[PDB]
């Protein structure tokens, strides 16, 4: 009857590293190899009562008493130097290949059927649309999450590191290439073919991606935020902790991977939001909602079950979504 496998673990393609933040001045970014790193430091914040009150704390005496005892805490803060207006963020990306092959599979017949399904996809249309959209999210600085919202000029440089050396160099204007449209461009097409060769398994590709953002002198930059155990004293609370590896502000690799993953424009709801990350049940953390609900028969699992088990191939857009979710990887199958 060819039921689905209980264990369907997949390994991820498109492996990014931690993205390190350094700082410097515009028009000296061609010699940015020795730019000083952005350092996460401590500052003190004093806050008032600015949250909603539950109809019992709205008493004027209680509210004023809460004012007389403000919350004192220290926060991890990352800022550019006062003589530097450009933020440099550098990471390396490795594209593996072999997306349709699971890392663990209970059923051999289901494994073979899934391999035939993915091979039929690649033979019909290869990793060309998906790689083009991944190259688009590389060209624009979407991995530069909050450091791009107010940057005046953003430039992304992507190199192909073959034997430890730049075999091919790309330079992009990350603001001309927006965060909404997946258009066509010759350099975007070349990077798309490179990522396609990586995803198909034709050759080994390693991409060094460097983004420069002209934000301003001494302006705040935004690395990834860590978890606080919340055990110390209230005055030295450490309400905000920033991610660094060796005294250098950094962005988590999975955040970079999530920003590169933002290629899903095929979800049933409208195009007002634009692309979203290719996740099962189309989850967006900021909106707190799930596009591609399982009730709407457009999530990853129902589409994969219809495509593989019972040969109901969906539309080519949903096929792109399914293959991008297999590239994304995850612990599929019933636990």
């Amino acid at each position: 009857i060819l039921s689905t496998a209980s264990v369907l673990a997949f390994e991820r393609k498109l492996d990014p590293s931690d993205a390190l933040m350094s700082a410097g001045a515009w028009a000296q970014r061609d010699a940015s190899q020795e730019w000083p790193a952005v350092t996460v430091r401590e500052k003190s914040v004093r806050g008032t009562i600015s949250n909603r009150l539950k109809t019992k704390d709205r008493d004027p005496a209680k509210l004023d008493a809460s004012i007389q005892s403000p919350n004192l805490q220290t926060v991890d803060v990352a800022n550019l130097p006062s003589d530097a207006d450009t933020l440099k963020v550098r990471f390396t990306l490795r594209v593996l290949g072999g997306a349709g092959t699971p890392s663990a599979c209970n059923d051999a017949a289901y494994r073979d059927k899934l391999l035939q399904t993915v091979a039929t996809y690649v033979n019909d249309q290869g990793f060309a649309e998906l790689a083009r959209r991944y190259a688009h999210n590389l060209a624009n600085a979407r991995f530069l999450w909050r450091n791009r919202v107010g940057a005046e000029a953003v430039e992304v440089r992507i190199n192909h590191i073959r034997q430890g050396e730049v075999a091919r160099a790309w330079r992009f204007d990350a603001l001309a290439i927006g965060l909404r449209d997946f258009k066509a461009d010759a350099e975007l097409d070349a990077l798309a073919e490179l990522i396609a060769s990586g995803l198909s398994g034709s050759g080994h590709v390693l991409l060094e991606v460097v983004a420069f953002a002209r934000i301003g002198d001494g302006q705040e930059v935004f690395p990834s935020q860590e978890l606080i155990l919340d055990k110390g004293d209230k005055k030295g609370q450490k309400s905000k902790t920033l991610y660094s590896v060796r005294d250098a502000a950094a962005i988590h690799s999975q955040k970079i991977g999530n920003a590169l993953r933002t290629i899903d424009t095929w979800y049933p709801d409208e195009d007002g939001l634009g692309p979203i990350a290719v996740e099962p049940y189309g989850s967006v953390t900021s909106q707190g909602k799930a596009y591609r609900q399982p009730k709407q028969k457009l999530d990853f699992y129902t589409l994969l079950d219809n495509w593989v088990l019972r040969d109901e191939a969906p539309a080519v857009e949903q096929q792109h979504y399914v293959i991008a979710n297999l590239i994304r990887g995850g612990v599929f199958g019933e636990a």
């Binding site: 909603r52 539950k54 109809t55 019992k56 707190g288 019933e334």
Partner: protein, 228 residues
């Protein structure tokens, strides 16, 4: 001696013994299906009751952790202020109209989740009564978290009959419901021998697989699913 079966659990002894102090001993290991839970070295002079009492505490803490892990999510009926809880209902699933909500004064009654980011909608007492009637959770709804989703589905084309081990979650005296097999057969209007044929071990020639309607009516009458 021989293996002790307590619902889904099994206390099997080691084949070869040992001597601790001057007295003979065997290692008794506790299982939950294929999951080994604990091993104890016990004297050979213990009876089955003492061996069972040695693992009763581990079984009890497993039961407590299973009740707290798979407890049904709770909906709360609040006033316009959103502070005073007027009624609490535990539901097997949430209403499909739940969205991010803070109560206003435009509506007197609001139904909200007990989860910290609260989801809700304005509700009347008639609508709240209807939702609580058609969404409530049975008192032993936590046992469904210990069972796979392919034995608890109402879709007959996606349904699989439960195995003997999955039956013993709810049918035995050492099970999570605490009813006997004869009581379970009386609930289904079935002979006790025919129902024992359902929970027969693998070392048996006469084994029967329970049907869709019988299994789901058993779950209804046991207070596990579809009982509100």
């Amino acid at each position: 001696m021989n293996a002790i079966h307590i619902g889904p659990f099994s206390i099997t002894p080691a084949a070869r013994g040992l001597h601790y102090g001057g007295l003979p001993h065997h290692q008794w290991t506790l299982y939950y299906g294929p999951r080994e839970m604990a091993i104890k070295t016990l004297p050979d002079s213990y009876t089955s009751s003492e061996v069972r009492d040695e693992f009763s505490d581990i079984i009890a803490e497993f039961v407590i952790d299973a009740r707290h892990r798979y407890a049904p999510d709770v909906l709360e009926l609040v006033n316009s202020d959103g502070d005073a809880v007027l009624a609490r209902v535990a539901v097997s699933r949430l209403p499909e109209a739940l969205s991010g909500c803070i109560p206003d004064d435009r509506f007197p009654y609001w139904l909200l989740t007990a989860s910290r980011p609260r989801l809700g909608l304005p509700v009347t007492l008639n609508e709240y009564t209807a939702l609580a009637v058609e969404l409530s959770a049975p008192p032993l709804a936590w046992i469904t978290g210990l069972l796979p989703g392919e034995v608890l589905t109402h879709d007959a084309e996606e349904w699989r009959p439960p195995t003997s081990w999955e039956l013993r979650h709810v049918v035995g005296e050492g099970s999570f419901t605490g009813v006997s097999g004869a009581a379970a057969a009386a609930l289904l209007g079935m002979s006790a021998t025919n129902f024992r044929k359902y929970t027969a071990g693998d070392s048996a020639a006469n084994r029967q697989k329970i049907s869709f309607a019988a299994w789901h009516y058993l779950l209804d009458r046991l207070g596990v699913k579809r009982a509100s």
